[PDB]
């Protein structure tokens, strides 16, 4: 009946990737096991960010499979709603950080430069 | 080649309805009826054809000058949280017109909320009990809910507003017994993300007399 | 070669899933073994549930981890000393594919209102912090000819506890017939529990 | 004198990478500009997580430069202290998520499977 | 070819940095141009600070964005209509390389204690970018009673001890003759640069 | 080849000191002195040689049976937040012994805190004023700090403990005037990450007499 739009589309991708086969149960879990260890939202957002960034990269690889484009882009928007709270700036800043190439010589020089002020505010505000 | 684009499109966001309408496109030399194609896209996404698989209704190469996304079934249509952008064009075979792109909308943010439905009032001793239906059924109450206001006043008196209250039933306590009171019910859609509220339309006036004892 | 079983299905009520299957009649009486494989356990392999059993069912309530975690069931047949190929079932999520009992409703009068108690279904009996629980209660209250749907969220500490949920509806002295039925909606898949037995009261 | 251990080691890497030249100022900022947009810790940790994963990735490529190994792993420990609150489990869970290959066919099937229950708890309680 | 300047240095006090350089004496009077380039500005380009100036200094307080953001300074010389190559300086962080004034100390007696007021240096109080990394995190307050000194630490984040105008420390005292001399210094947030030590203020217990 | 490993190593974590010691290794046929090598590692790190470049003290190829990390200069040694693991071995040219690996330590977590230094007590009207120095100087007070406890009692009386208090000066108000009181000062190191505490050692007992009025 009434269920969040991702459920319908997520199980559609489940069939396309054969994620319903009994062989997926092998070799533990990627995200579900870790996420149960961290109940504090600060810890969760640290882990969820890496998980959300993972799905966006995965969907980017299958942007050419037009069979699943409907299911993919619906889940992407629901992630934009649940995780980024529909904040377009939050979504756009997130995408910039991901796309930085760690082999771009200019990027690492700027990264090494900004390191001090990044470490300066890694700890929570007083 | 090139055709004239559809004229003056409108997005009707009333209650749970989602209807896109436009003025038809005609030619002087018209051989067959012109069809239209509607497409939707999310904030940073690809354009999709509005077809039975994508949205559950057939809105491409259709003869009608409107398309109702919410007609098929409950919860069908675009999710009320999503940021949806629509565009439209008229085409006659190989010929097609320019894309008429609508402004972006989020359902909770742009909806025109109607009055509460099926209002029933029963008198009590110096009070009036009001039971009513919600303006529309929301899937997730945690993300959005309704706040109701009752505008009550004695006949020929100054306005008084009781509210807001979450429940669909309220008691108008502390009223003058055996006196006529008139009331109006008005809802308010609250979306926690928006931190701005949508003021719903008021219902018709209806006056009732309280009991004696 | 011993034939493989057919039509493997899983039916769960109150998170107690049972595996069913069909087998052809044969001169000998065949025995079966039922194996379960859960998602979300380290080094997951097929766990034996029922061993060399002669009937066509197997209760796997003990093999239910998270009611929102998928699980698979396969069954093979043994006749004499020769066994058959496995008959694997579709993935089964107790929260999605299963069904939950109705909540218990209690009604009582007060001076200016009616207190409706919505007791959680018998599943959530203390006697594990899973995704599968109730998020909203659809409480249908019919007063005379018309019924209006209410929504009570479990997250509201002021309206629900772990043992009960309450809703207060104002009433008047005139003749009125209030009939109340309530159902629960699950968090992830929106699966609706069975509708409660409609309890009424009159003024 | 008294300063967090990263400062001494971070500016040593600046000299090694020539991050002190005036040409580094070009092309805006990577991290500093974004980090000033988000003051709420929930929003910060979302961004900082991607930044911390970036530095760990960068350090992993230069694990063979013995000139900077002391400075590199000293900064790593200070990150283990400041960002992970010296929680080894937090550090190890973070390291696991990063090492997941998005092209491993087995990994994406499991990711598509767990997607439903991940989305279920993306929003705050 | 006109020679390029030499020995470019930057000295900052109270976040007011001055650029200095040396140049050889010549028959004509040469003029210089000083250009600043900050880190953290989109499409960063060199900003002119002093243009065709004849002396060997240039106050660039207006070109200070974030006191914790690096900035670079280069200067060239012009004689007649011919110019020289630029003389670039090392990177300069106002918070790291600069120096901050001392705090102002006030002392006053009460019935059972002494209330020491530590007013922040005049840089941070005014009516020069705000919301910066660069501020004081702890105050090292040294209290010498007769011969002996004990170090105190007052954290800026403590709302009960510090506000935007001052920081306070309460020390209990007795009736016997005592000489309390107090000096205080501030420590910067990231680089730990210590401000100048305050002028020692004393007080005596005559009763 | 192979040598006997150093015997009974110990890590002294007292106040701000960080000293690794061990029993010497001897041979029957010994022509020249045996040296030792100390190495340190972080939680998920590489082993580093303890040399003047790495840690500021030379603890590689050393004849001594100890290695003092905090002796060189103020702020020297391992950061008190860090998870540090040390290992040790004896070597004689090509021959060396097995690695003796110490248990991991975090200084705030494993330190044995000493008593407050330079305690001075001055009597007051029905009171005693206590000023003392901190057991050691902490770089970041927000990460770790001291809580002080004063164990005071009248001569022939029962113990009373005032505390805890953050300041290095305290007033023992409400005391019997012109009476002798004996006191002890004891510190308590609190690390907010661990939310577990290090109980410091108490100072010597010292008795003082309060003022007249
Ligand atoms: C400060 O830093 C130290 C050093 O890194 C940490 O101590 C280590 O902590 C890790 C856990 O993060 C330990 O790793 C464990 O090792 C086990 C095997 O090692 C044992 O046996 C060898 C001898 O061969 C010795 O090293 C030692 O006696 C060990 O006891 C593994 O079996 C463990 O894995 C198991 O558990 C995990 C988690 O449940 C599962 O995922 C695995 O599948 C497996 O079941 C584990 O990897 C390591 O042994 C510790 N070293 C020491 C010397 O103690 C401190 O924890 C750290 N302190 C803080 C506060 O951060
Ligand atoms: C919803 O998505 C639309 C489509 O991107 C956003 O509208 C446009 O956004 C771009 C980029 O931010 C702007 O350049 C346009 O000016 C926007 N259009 C209009 C008419 O303003 C819209 O901002 C999104 N909504 C939210 C709340 O983020
Ligand atoms: C599980 O991992 C092993 C290697 O670690 C691999 O051989 C195996 O194929 C994996 N399981 C599945 C179902 O792919
Ligand atoms: C959509 O409706 C139109 C009616 O004008 C019809 O011609 C067209 O074939 C329909 N499309 C599909 C896919 O059925
Ligand atoms: C919805 O409202 C927003 C803000 O008022 C506006 O920017 C947007 O254009 C509106 N959308 C439509 C379709 O009117
Ligand atoms: C309210 O008044 C309108 C007239 O504008 C009418 O159409 C509508 O039916 C009335 N509502 C009810 C419940 O009668
Ligand atoms: C198995 O199920 C199918 C479809 O439901 C049905 O046609 C068939 O008769 C079943 N087989 C048996 C043995 O009941
Ligand atoms: C299955 O077995 C469990 C105990 O192992 C029992 O509690 C449960 O009721 C059984 N299921 C049914 C349907 O009886
Ligand atoms: C800045 O980026 C441009 C391309 O976007 C590049 O050509 C240029 O070299 C970069 N700046 C520096 C200092 O490398
Ligand atoms: C310039 O600096 C160098 C090195 O610091 C010094 O030897 C030289 O004397 C300086 N020249 C002048 C003119 O100050
Ligand atoms: C530098 O200039 C600023 C603003 O122009 C001024 O406030 C400051 O006093 C000047 N400093 C010096 C040393 O001249
Ligand atoms: C370290 O000290 C020992 C003293 O036994 C000495 O032999 C050795 O040369 C020293 N190492 C260095 C690098 O100075
Ligand atoms: C330090 O303390 C921890 C527990 O707090 C303990 O596991 C460890 O062995 C201790 N290390 C030393 C060197 O005492
Ligand atoms: C405390 O007593 C010990 C004797 O055990 C002595 O060595 C030490 O100096 C005394 N401390 C003071 C401050 O007098």
* Domain residue ranges of chain E, discontinuous segments joined by +: 1-98, 99-207
- Closest protein CA for atom 3 of ligand 9: D27
Q: Is A19 part of the contact surface with chain D (CB cutoff 8 Å)?
A: yes
Q: How far apart are CA D59 and CA A102, in angstroms?
A: 10
Domains E1-98 and E99-207 share a fold: yes
Q: Which residue of D has its CA nearest to E132?
A: D36
- Give burial (CB, 10 Å; 0-12/13-18/19+) of D117: buried
Q: And the tokens for C148?
A: 């209006």
Q: Which residue of D has its CA nearest to E190?
A: D3
What per-residue string of b and e applies to C33-42 under the rule 16 or more CB within 10 Å gives b?
A: bbbbbbbbbe
Q: And the tokens for B155?
A: 């006949």
Q: And the tokens for C104?
A: 């218990």
Q: And the tokens for C191?
A: 């699966």
For chain E, how big is the Rg over CA atoms in Å? 23
Q: B99-107 contacts: CB < 8 A, separation 24 or more? A: B99/B5, B99/B39, B100/B5, B100/B6, B100/B9, B100/B22, B102/B9, B102/B11, B102/B20, B104/B43, B105/B11, B105/B13, B106/A86, B106/B80, B106/B81, B106/B82, B107/B13, B107/B18, B107/B78, B107/B79, B107/B80, B107/B81, B107/B82
Q: How far apart are CA F26 and CA E117, in angstroms?
A: 62
CB–CB contact D118 A57 (8 Å): no
Contacts of A56 in chain B (CB under 8 A): none
* HSE-up (13 A, CA, CB side) for residue E142: 15
* HSE-up (13 A, CA, CB side) for residue B126: 6
Q: Which of D53, C188, D113 is nearest to A31 (CA)?
A: D113
Decide whether any atom of ligand 1 lies within 6 Å of the F85 Cβ: yes
What single DSSP character describes residue E162?
Answer: B
Resolution of the coordinates in A?
Answer: 3.2
Measured from the Cβ of residue E191, the count of other Cβ atoms closer than 10 Å reads 22
User: What pairs with residue C6 in β-bridges?
Assistant: C22
**Neighbouring chains to A with at least 3 Cβ pairs closer than 8 Å:** B, C, D, E
Classify E99-207 by CATH class.
mainly beta
Q: And the tokens for F204?
A: 């010597």
CB–CB contact A120 E157 (8 Å): no
Q: How far apart are CA E141 and CA B124, in angstroms?
A: 73
What one-character-per-residue DSSP string does E112-148 give?
SEEEEEEEPPTTT-----SS-S-SEEEEEEEEEETTE
User: What pairs with residue F131 in β-bridges?
Assistant: F120, F169
Q: At A77, is the secondary structure helix, strand, or coil?
A: helix
- Closest protein CA for atom 9 of ligand 7: C7
By residue count, chain F amounts to: 213
Distance from residue A85's CA to the centre of ligand 2 (Å): 15
The H-assigned helical ranges of chain B are 52-55, 107-110
What one-character-per-residue DSSP string does E9-61 give?
EEEEETTEEEEEEE----SS--EEEEEEEESSSTT--PEEEEEEE-SSEEE-G
Q: Is F68 part of the contact surface with chain D (CB cutoff 8 Å)?
A: no
CATH for the stretch C1-98 = 2.60.40.10
Q: How far apart are CA C107 and CA C118, in angstroms?
A: 9
Contacts of E189 in chain A (CB under 8 A): 120
Is the Cα dihedral C164, C165, C168, C173 positive or negative?
A: negative
Classify F117-213 by CATH class.
mainly beta
Flag whether C touches A (3+ CB pairs, 8 A cutoff).
yes
Distance from residue C19's CA to the centre of ligand 6 (Å): 56
Classify C99-203 by CATH class.
mainly beta
The H-assigned helical ranges of F49-155 are 107-110
* Residues B74, B79, B81, B85, Cα dihedral to 10°: -140
Q: Which atom of ligand 12 is nearest to the CA of F62?
A: 5
What is the end-to-end Cα distance of chain C in Å, rounded? 72
Q: And the tokens for C166?
A: 């309450």
Q: Is B43 part of the contact surface with chain A (CB cutoff 8 Å)?
A: yes
Q: Are C99 and C183 in contact (CB under 8 A)?
A: no
Residue B116: partners with Cβ closer than 8 Å, 6 or more residues away: B132, B133, B134, B135, B148, B168, B185, B186, B187, B203
Range of the domain at D8: 1-125
Q: Are D49 and A51 in contact (CB under 8 A)?
A: no
Domain count, chain A: 1
CA angle F61, F67, F68 (to 5 degrees): 140
The H-assigned helical ranges of chain C are 94-97
* Domain residue ranges of chain B, discontinuous segments joined by +: 6-113, 117-213
Q: Indicate which CATH number applies to the domain containing D99.
A: 1.20.1250.10
Q: Which residue of F has its CA nearest to E111?
A: F125
Q: And the tokens for C181?
A: 């039925």
CB–CB contact E133 A126 (8 Å): no
What one-character-per-residue DSSP string does C43-100 give?
T--PEEEEEEE-SSEEE-GGG---TTS-EEEEEEEEETTEE---EEPPPB-HHHHSB-
The helix-helix angle for D105-120 and A41-61 (nearest 10°) equals: 130
**Is beta strand E148-155 parallel, antiparallel or unpaired with respect to E136-145?**
antiparallel
Assigned superfamily of F6-113: Immunoglobulins (2.60.40.10)
Q: Is A120 part of the contact surface with chain E (CB cutoff 8 Å)?
A: yes
């Amino acid at each position: 009946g009434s269920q969040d739009p991702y459920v319908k589309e997520a199980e559609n991708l489940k069939k396309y990737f054969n994620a319903g086969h009994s062989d997926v149960a092998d070799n533990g879990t990627l995200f579900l096991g870790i996420l149960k260890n961290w109940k504090e939202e600060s810890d969760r957002k640290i882990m969820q960010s890496q998980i959300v960034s993972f799905y966006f990269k995965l969907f980017k690889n299958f942007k050419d499979d037009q069979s699943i484009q409907k299911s993919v882009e619906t889940i992407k928007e629901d992630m934009n709603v649940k995780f980024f709270n529909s904040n377009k700036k939050k979504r756009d800043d997130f995408e910039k950080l991901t796309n930085y190439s760690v082999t771009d010589l200019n990027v690492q020089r700027k990264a090494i430069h900004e390191l001090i002020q990044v470490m300066a505010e890694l700890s929570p505000a007083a | 080649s090139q055709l004239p684009a559809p004229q003056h499109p409108k997005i009707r966001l009333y209650n749970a309805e989602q209807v896109l309408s436009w003025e038809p496109v005609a030619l002087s030399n018209s051989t067959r009826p012109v069809v239209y194609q509607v497409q939707f896209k999310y904030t940073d996404s690809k354009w999709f054809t509005a077809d039975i698989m994508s949205i559950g209704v057939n809105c491409t190469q259709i003869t009608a000058t409107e398309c109702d996304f919410t007609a098929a079934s409950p919860s069908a249509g675009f999710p009320m949280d999503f940021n949806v952008t629509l565009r439209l064009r008229a085409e006659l075979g190989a010929l097609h017109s320019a894309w008429v792109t609508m402004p972006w909308f989020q359902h909770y943010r742009n909806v025109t909320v109607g009055p509460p439905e099926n209002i029933e009032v029963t008198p009590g001793e110096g009070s009036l009990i009001i039971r009513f239906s919600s303006p529309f059924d929301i899937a997730d109450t945690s993300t959005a809910f309704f706040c109701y206001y009752v505008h009550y006043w004695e006949k020929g008196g100054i306005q008084q507003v009781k509210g807001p209250f979450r429940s669909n039933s309220i008691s108008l306590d502390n009223l003058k017994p055996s006196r006529v009171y008139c009331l109006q019910v008005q809802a308010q859609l609250l979306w926690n993300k928006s931190n701005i509220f949508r003021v719903g339309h008021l219902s018709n006036i209806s006056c009732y007399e309280t009991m004696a004892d | 070669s011993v034939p493989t079983p057919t039509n493997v299905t899983i039916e769960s009520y109150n998170m107690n899933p049972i595996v069913y299957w069909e087998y052809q009649i044969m001169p000998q009486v065949p025995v079966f073994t039922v194996e379960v494989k859960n998602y979300g356990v380290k080094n997951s392999e097929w766990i034996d549930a029922c061993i060399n059993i002669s009937h066509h069912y197997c209760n796997i309530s003990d093999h239910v981890g998270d009611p929102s975690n998928s699980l698979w069931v396969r069954v093979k047949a043994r006749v004499g000393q020769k066994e058959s190929a496995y008959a694997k079932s579709e993935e089964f999520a107790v929260c999605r594919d299963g069904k939950i009992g109705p909540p218990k409703l209690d009604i009582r009068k007060e001076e200016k209102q009616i207190m409706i108690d919505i007791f959680h279904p018998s599943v959530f009996v203390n006697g594990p912090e899973t995704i599968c629980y109730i998020r909203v209660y659809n409480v249908y209250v019919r007063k005379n000819g018309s019924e209006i749907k209410y929504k009570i969220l479990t997250q509201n500490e002021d309206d629900c506890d772990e043992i009960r949920c309450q809703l207060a509806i104002p009433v008047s002295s005139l003749n009125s017939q209030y009939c109340v039925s309530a159902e629960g909606v699950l968090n992830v898949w929106g699966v609706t529990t069975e509708k409660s037995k409609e309890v009424c009261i009159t003024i």
